[PDB]
Structure 1
Amino acid sequence: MKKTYRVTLTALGPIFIGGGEKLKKYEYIFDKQKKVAHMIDHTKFTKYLLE
């Protein structure tokens, strides 16, 4: 009879769903030597280079 339940999925390990977006060696990826990575948007990158 439509037994609705609230599922709280506790991520005990690394959870990855992907979704079809591959990031190449230097293609939108910005990896620096302080053990964090930043990533960029294609539109503002391309117009920031074309300006």
Structure 2
Amino acid sequence: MKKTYRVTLTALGPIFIGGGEKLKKYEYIFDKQKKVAHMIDHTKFTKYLLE
């Protein structure tokens, strides 16, 4: 009766979940030999391309 636990997940392999977003080939992604992929925030980029 009402046994509460604390499930601790330790990823052995890679864990990926959902998102609802498909970031395109050009949309906010930059990878080079320093091996990072910065994601640019969404509306600030186009409101900075406004000016």
User: TM (normalized to structure 1)?
Assistant: 0.87
1:23-45 CA-partner distances (Å, limit 9, x unpaired): 11111222233111100111110
1-structure distance, mates of 2:28, 2:5:
40
Give unmatched runs, 5+ long, in structure 1. Answer: none
CA contact (8 A) 2:28 2:39 kept: yes
What is aligned with 2:4? 4
Give unmatched runs, 5+ long, in structure 2. Answer: none
**Structure 1 residue 19: deviation in Å?**
1.8
Q: CA RMSD in A?
A: 1.0
User: TM (normalized to structure 2)?
Assistant: 0.87
Moved more, 11-20 or 28-37: 28-37
Q: How does 1:1-51 map to 2 (within 5 A)?
A: 1-51=1-51
Moved more, 28-37 or 18-27: 28-37
Percent identity over paired residues? 100
